[PDB]
């Protein structure tokens, strides 16, 4: 699961966030998902979230998702930071 | 000059509500005439500028719950609580950089 | 769960050797020392357990190393580039080490 | 499909013993005979350089394993199970011919 904290939502965000998702729909079934936050409506990390830096995680990601995020970060300025924890399966462990 | 190899307190917040900022100045105040030298406050705020720095990141704030004394303590469970303003914080040791605080 | 804490730093390594061990001896001191209660240092030899578990993943050295304390990141550092032997490493949240993760 | 894309199924793996490099040789036959045009076999061995790429990350084999095809995972299953070669597992995509840059 890709965890996206955001400052705000703009259209062009929203539009690139709901590619995000169709990207994620269409080609990573099971093996990617997203979770994306606004920061000004919730500020309060809680427990195991955290925050890394956009060029943390986005140089080990997928091209186009490398792309999209490249986008939010730099076009919308809009893209904090992400996380990707991502303790992934179908059936809950801790979790 | 210098009790040397300083903390680094680094906050990470949302706005500067009216209070947010007089508890920022107390908390620093304290810093300053109580814990003398060992420490050093950062300020982020997230919204004047989105874009982490590569060599920042951002930890829960029930973690690093335990290091820090209580005086401060009250006033990070503050910052959390009367003000949904803090997101998280970090605490480095250093220092790779330099000029940033004399 | 409970032991709660805490930020656990996995590095990945490919064999045991002396230099390794005493730099990973120092790296385990720094981090129960000033970071005790932040930071956990587990170490994995991919030569005695090349299988990832379910939860376990491994990201590049130079992905994680800018967001760690230079102290920590000086002796990564060195076991990237001086002695050769660090592949990957990961930073979780939970949820005890040593004692150990059991 | 603009016009072509790729996958690129990289293996990531501890060493390179006599007979587990048949069975790689085997899973490209494989995966370029039934398959064609999408399943690109790269495999990284960790222990000829331990040292990442920063745009490498390793991750579970069964994680992964969700969306492989039966041979495959027939394959992944025999090379994790039976000579503990295995370490893990990363899913990338792109238009790789010709296109070193990658």
Request: no cysteine; charged share 25%.
């Amino acid at each position: 699961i890709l965890k996206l904290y955001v400052a705000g939502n703009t259209p062009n965000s929203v539009r690139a966030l709901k590619t995000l998702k169709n990207i994620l729909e269409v080609e990573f079934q099971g093996v990617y998902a997203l979770k994306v936050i606004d920061v000004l409506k919730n500020p309060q990390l809680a427990e195991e979230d955290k925050i890394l830096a956009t060029p943390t995680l986005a140089k080990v990601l997928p091209l186009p998702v490398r792309r999209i995020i490249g986008d939010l970060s730099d076009r919308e300025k809009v893209l904090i930071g992400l996380d990707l924890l991502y303790g992934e399966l179908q059936d809950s462990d801790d979790f």
